[PDB]
Amino acid sequence: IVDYRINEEEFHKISLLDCDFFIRKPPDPDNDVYDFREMYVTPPDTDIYAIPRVLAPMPQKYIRCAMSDYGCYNVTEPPIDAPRDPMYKSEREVSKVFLTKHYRNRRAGDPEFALDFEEIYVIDSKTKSITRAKVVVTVPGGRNRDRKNDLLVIRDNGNSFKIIPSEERDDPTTVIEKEEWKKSRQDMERHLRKLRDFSVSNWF
Amino acid sequence: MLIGLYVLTSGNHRGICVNRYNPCNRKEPFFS
Amino acid sequence: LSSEYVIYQPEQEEEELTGYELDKRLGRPHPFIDPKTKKKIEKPLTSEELWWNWRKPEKEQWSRWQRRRPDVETVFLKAMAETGQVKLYGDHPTLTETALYRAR
Amino acid sequence: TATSISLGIDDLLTIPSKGWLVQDAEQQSLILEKHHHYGNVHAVEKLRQSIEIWYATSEYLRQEMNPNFRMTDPFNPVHIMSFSGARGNASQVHQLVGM
Amino acid sequence: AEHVRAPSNGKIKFNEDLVHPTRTRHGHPAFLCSIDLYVTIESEDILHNVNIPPKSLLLVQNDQYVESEQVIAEIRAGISTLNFKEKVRKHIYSDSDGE
Amino acid sequence: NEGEEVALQSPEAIEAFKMLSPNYRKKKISDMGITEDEYYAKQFEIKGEIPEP
């Protein structure tokens, strides 16, 4: 606990499921400049500030980043105790926030604008920690690869980051069918294992 | 009517039933 | 020069050229148990050492369930085992294969 | 009316392990009868063993009935009628496709 | 009274010194279990560990080979006083004449 | 004599439980030193009081 109440007007307020993250914002025309020198984490809608867990080397200079949100929608069924009581309740339930630095700190309105997928900072509400993501560049070109053709694939609950070309992508139907087929194969093998003839058998 | 509703909302073959091989080596209709 | 976080793997040369793993990945006809990884288990207790409750009868008794119940699944598996559409472990379809066919 | 669900003879699917279970149960019953004739066990033990083993076999068959339908033939008409709630029960379907 | 069944075909390996010998109600010999034990079903590719600490009946022996879904043990954890307990009597009838 | 589904504590009951296995009988035969033909005849032995010749 810092024990002093900061002025949240000069900070970036990022809301999470169980936490609120504050990052100092330098004066800028477009609110996309972040200062990672001063940062605080608070309980949900609480004015008791604290120091977050810095688990990775944080940038010590002003950088222009793009915020994103990661989570799952919780569509519940609230009890109906009134005539016009709502039939459903939908919540975004953000879990991880991704900060993607702009290439060369360029503005969004510039003629050449690209996102630097090599410097990703994630924020976790469960662990109350901010760390730097580990990406696996696989696009040919090394460090001279053009940033106008890049695709960042995020899987495994925000733990796997890969940079692949834009043309080499899979449609949503493909990945959905892949995961469904994998789960179905695993469950079918689990079900058929208990049969006394599973040993002398063949999956066709 | 319960049988009809169950047939309507049952679903579709999702895993090994819909495809013989893994789609890794490799839904379609879009309606507005 | 490269940082700990920024990994570089330009050459993707990881291929499961082994037949069993390739068929398991691509969903091709392959045995459920890898024949290479099969381990010969040691000899268990003989019929004499087991108790009388678990001791099998010396002469094979008669039962109405000694034969295998005929089914459409077995006939269709025998029909499609020919012409090379599917491959079965042996010459006669087993119950696990009949269930898999009932599914697919 | 459009789908026209129906039930047939081959549509009553038994679990793929009924034969093995019934065979081992009757084998144990015959072994126990032979040993009862020898004098190793008395009448009440034979009665308890038979009742318990057959009740356990029937209960295991009824327990494995539903997962078999869900995994192997999810769109089975009997399974649809039982799971939807239209007509039937687990006990009643056990009489049809089990024991 | 839940019945533990073998997950797959294989040999049973356990330490017989911890279990106490006893006689089951079915006239069969078994090992009484009173402490949490670990038994291993040794199969071609995998090992399985399933057992429950409280008073149970082990109807198998060490190094014995068992097939899938056979009754390895009987948990028998459910035990309580029965107010409806009845002293039912059964008679044994002679099957041959003599002295 | 002891009961049903109770841990056997009598020495003769545990002895018979171990004797239910053929290997234990073979081990006991080897320990006693008698032959198999002698062990077969030991079963057919008159027990109780034996009259004087």
Helix fraction bin of chain A: 10-25%
Task: Report the largest inter-chain contact.
Answer: A-C, 26 and 29 residues
Main sheet of chain F?
none
The side-by-side strand order for the widest beta sheet of chain A comes to 1-2-3-5-8-9-10-4
Output the helix-strand order of chain F.
Answer: HHH
What amount of the residues of chain A lies in strands? 35-45%
Oligomer: part of a larger assembly
Rg of chain A is: 22 Å
* Helical run tally of chain A: 1
- How are helices and strands ordered from N to C of chain A? EEEEEEEEEEEEEHE
The number of helical segments of chain F is 3
Number of strands of chain A: 14
User: Rounded to an integer, what's the Rg of chain F over CA atoms?
Assistant: 15 Å
Strand content of chain F: under 5%
> How far apart are the termini of chain A?
61 Å
Indicate the structural class of chain F. mainly alpha
Biggest beta sheet summary of chain A:
8 strands, mixed
Please tell me what the overall shape of chain F is. Answer: flat
- SS content category of chain A: mainly beta
Form type of chain A: extended
A few lines on this structure:
With 32 residues, chain B is mostly helical. Chain B contains one helix and no strands. The radius of gyration of chain B is 14 Å and the shape is flat.
Overall description:
The structure is cut from a larger assembly and holds 1 copy of chain A (204 residues), 1 copy of chain B (32 residues), 1 copy of chain C (104 residues), 2 copies of chain D (99 residues) and 1 copy of chain F (53 residues). Chain B is built from 1 helix and no strands. Chain B is mainly alpha-helical. Chain B is flat, with a radius of gyration of 14 Å. Chain B starts with a helix and ends in a 23-residue tail after the last helix. Chain D has 99 residues and is mainly alpha-helical. Chain D contains 4 helices and no strands. The two termini of chain D are 32 Å apart. Chain F has 53 residues and is mainly alpha-helical. Chain F contains 3 helices and no strands. Chains in contact: A-B, A-C, A-D, A-E, B-C, B-D, C-D, C-E, C-F, D-E, E-F. At the B-D interface, α1 of B face α3 of D. β11 of chain A pairs parallel with β1 of chain C, so a sheet runs across the interface.
Descriptive labels:
part of a larger assembly, 6 chains, C: 104 residues, mainly alpha, 3 helices, 26% helix, flat, F: 53 residues, 0% strand
Task: Outline the fold blueprint.
This is part of a larger assembly, with one copy of chain A (204 residues), one copy of chain B (32 residues), one copy of chain C (104 residues), two copies of chain D (99 residues) and one copy of chain F (53 residues).
Chain A: E1 11-15, E2 20-24, E3 33-42, E4 53-54, E5 63-71, E6 74-76, E7 89-91, E8 94-102, E9 115-124, E10 129-132, E11 135-137, E12 151-155, E13 160-164, H1 172-193, E14 202-203
Parallel strand pairs in A: 4-10, 11-13
Antiparallel strand pairs in A: 1-2, 2-3, 3-5, 5-8, 6-7, 8-9, 9-10, 12-13
Chain D: H1 18-38, H2 43-71, H3 77-84, H4 90-97
Chain F: H1 11-19, H2 22-32, H3 36-43
